Design a protein around this ligand. Structure first.
Ligand SMILES: Cc1cc2nc3c(=O)[nH]c(=O)nc-3n(C[C@H](O)[C@H](O)[C@H](O)COP(=O)(O)O)c2cc1C
Ligand SMILES: Cc1cc2nc3c(=O)[nH]c(=O)nc-3n(C[C@H](O)[C@H](O)[C@H](O)COP(=O)(O)O)c2cc1C
Ligand SMILES: O=C1NC(=O)NC(C(=O)O)N1
Ligand SMILES: O=C1NC(=O)NC(C(=O)O)N1
Lengths: 312, 312
């Protein structure tokens, strides 16, 4: 029995990694993720310049999940590029670098500089087209023309394999259109489904107040709230993009949740809210729990059940 | 202290009603809802002709909520119109009739015949622009040009006040556009937020199978999963449509959940999944629980706190 994967010309001890934004902003965070039992890690979505992000409080967790409006607080592209070039220990595990420019031009600027480092070191780009938290900036991939423009411009400027962090969709027509756009771009090798469920609103009954400060309380949802949405998106893109990989993200707290993502079609499985809440010890637990389910079912490898969800 | 309120030139004993589709398909169902302690009821979304709906199993409930792909099973508009015209006891509580044509023409056909009954009896139209479960029929109000066309044509053909059942949105730009479309139509007096969260996917780990048959397992989500999404939509439309009423729907299991909806801006509060699971006894519990919270806080009226959610 084993959790090993070999994909994108890299080897992974297991399918687990942090979700972008969680435990991955500082050098300390990245070293911590590297020291963990995760199979990989991804850095905080970055912008050209450092950002303070949105006003606090901007993250709150509850029994059923989280709400956040972080606002892309990050140390700036220069830092994450330097981490990938000079600091990351690739002998430990593969590194993904997430970018989330506020315009196509900003993304293009970053990828032009990332390309030689990706070539040399094998760092893998995750392009974030789904941030729901910057005021005045709607989710890029909810506008299919904008999505196409970003992918065209990034493909041309980068010229190397990359992946895309996608927002959740709720409409069959949108799964159809979004996947068709992705399929226009042969350099898009993986699709990460999903980013947080945008612009939810948590209200505290006692205080009669929203629980986060930015955007009048409106923030992205993660955790237990979003698992069926995440599974739907993973499966929708797994079915529609048979020549790409799908990475699952959303609502993973247990080996069983990971098992469901993998049944739906996930290769890598990312952990956001649950990792934020439990800390990096979660990775040993997820591995043990997934292996236990596999043992009970007689599955020896991930490929034996990946994408094998049954319909009625 | 009592929960009595007046809206749309009708008097309501309390703000609670069923969500369309739950306990409202047959004459038996409607008599049951009328006999309950709810402040109002709404009939099953109907089509011009009777429908069997999608193949079973098509509804499944879990601790965190429900998934459904009913497919508009209904007895046909003729029946619901007859119920409104001949059978409903308006002395008990107000009646809403929901319609969900599969085209603008079909909705127009229904509203032309509803009009005289609305004039005579005061039945209230809820136009469903958000069914996420009929194969090959995407949610109307995710297509803003289609939404405008439906509202223009229904407004012209009906000529009387009505309301609209809206899908959940997840994007500030979409709240902005959707509310602006609604504000073009003075006959739209209420906005019901939200219909089920479309095209989620629940998978059973033991059987490795989806849990509903239609559409390869993809169905609308209700219940605990969707409360922050529902609150966000209620509040977004409450803020953007200051001259209309907003009805809250989504994730109501308790008087506290109802309190949150009302804080967010809800006038009426609809109950779907929790009512499907618990039965019509839920309405006495919801009323008792809401009154208790109000008493603890020193609120004497719903008006004292409706829409008064605090921001930071
Ligand atoms: C604290 C916070 C910060 C996040 N930052 C990013 C980000 O930088 N880039 C990104 O693509 N997603 C970001 N996300 C979204 C997560 O990567 C993930 O898609 C989402 O939280 C759903 O997964 P979950 O249910 O495991 O939380 C963030 C989420 C949270 C909780
Ligand atoms: C069994 C089932 C059938 C439904 N049928 C309709 C329908 O006919 N028309 C409609 O507007 N909404 C329908 N809905 C959606 C509900 O009215 C409601 O918007 C949704 O379930 C969210 O509320 P909840 O969290 O209380 O379940 C249905 C929901 C379920 C559970
Ligand atoms: O892509 C993102 N997803 C989130 O949930 N939060 C952020 C962020 O605001 O940093 N970005
Ligand atoms: O508008 C609807 N919402 C739902 O959740 N289900 C249905 C239905 O399929 O009958 N219709």
């Amino acid at each position: 029995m084993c959790l090993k994967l070999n994909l994108l010309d890299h080897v992974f001890a297991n399918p687990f990694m942090n979700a972008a934004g969680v435990l991955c902003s500082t050098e300390e965070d990245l070293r911590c993720m590297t020291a963990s039992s995760s199979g990989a890690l991804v850095s905080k979505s970055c912008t050209s310049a450092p950002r303070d992000g949105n006003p606090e409080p901007r993250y709150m967790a509850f029994p059923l999940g989280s709400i956040n409006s972080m606002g892309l607080p990050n140390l700036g592209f220069d830092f994450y590029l330097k981490y990938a070039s000079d600091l990351h220990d690739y002998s430990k595990k593969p590194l993904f670098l997430s970018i989330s420019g506020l315009s196509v031009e900003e993304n293009v600027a970053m990828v032009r500089r990332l390309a030689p480092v990706a070539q040399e070191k094998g760092v893998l780009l995750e392009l974030n087209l789904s941030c729901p938290n910057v005021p005045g900036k709607p989710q890029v991939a909810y506008d299919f023309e904008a999505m196409r423009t970003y992918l065209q411009q990034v493909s041309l400027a980068y010229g190397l394999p990359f992946g895309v962090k996608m927002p959740p969709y709720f409409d069959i027509a949108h799964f159809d259109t979004a996947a068709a756009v992705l399929n226009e771009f042969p350099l898009v090798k993986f699709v990460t489904c999903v980013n947080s469920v945008g612009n939810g609103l948590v209200i505290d009954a006692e205080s009669e107040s929203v629980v986060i400060k930015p955007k009048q309380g409106f923030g992205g949802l993660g955790g237990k709230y979003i698992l069926p949405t995440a599974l739907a998106n993973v499966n929708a893109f797994y079915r529609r993009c048979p020549d790409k990989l799908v990475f699952g993200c959303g609502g993973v707290y247990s080996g069983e949740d990971a098992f469901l993502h993998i049944l739906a079609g996930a290769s890598m499985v990312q952990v956001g809210t649950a990792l934020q809440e439990e800390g990096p010890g979660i990775f040993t637990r997820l591995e043990d729990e997934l292996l236990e389910i596999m043992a009970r079912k007689g599955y020896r490898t991930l490929e034996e059940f990946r994408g094998r969800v049954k319909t009625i």
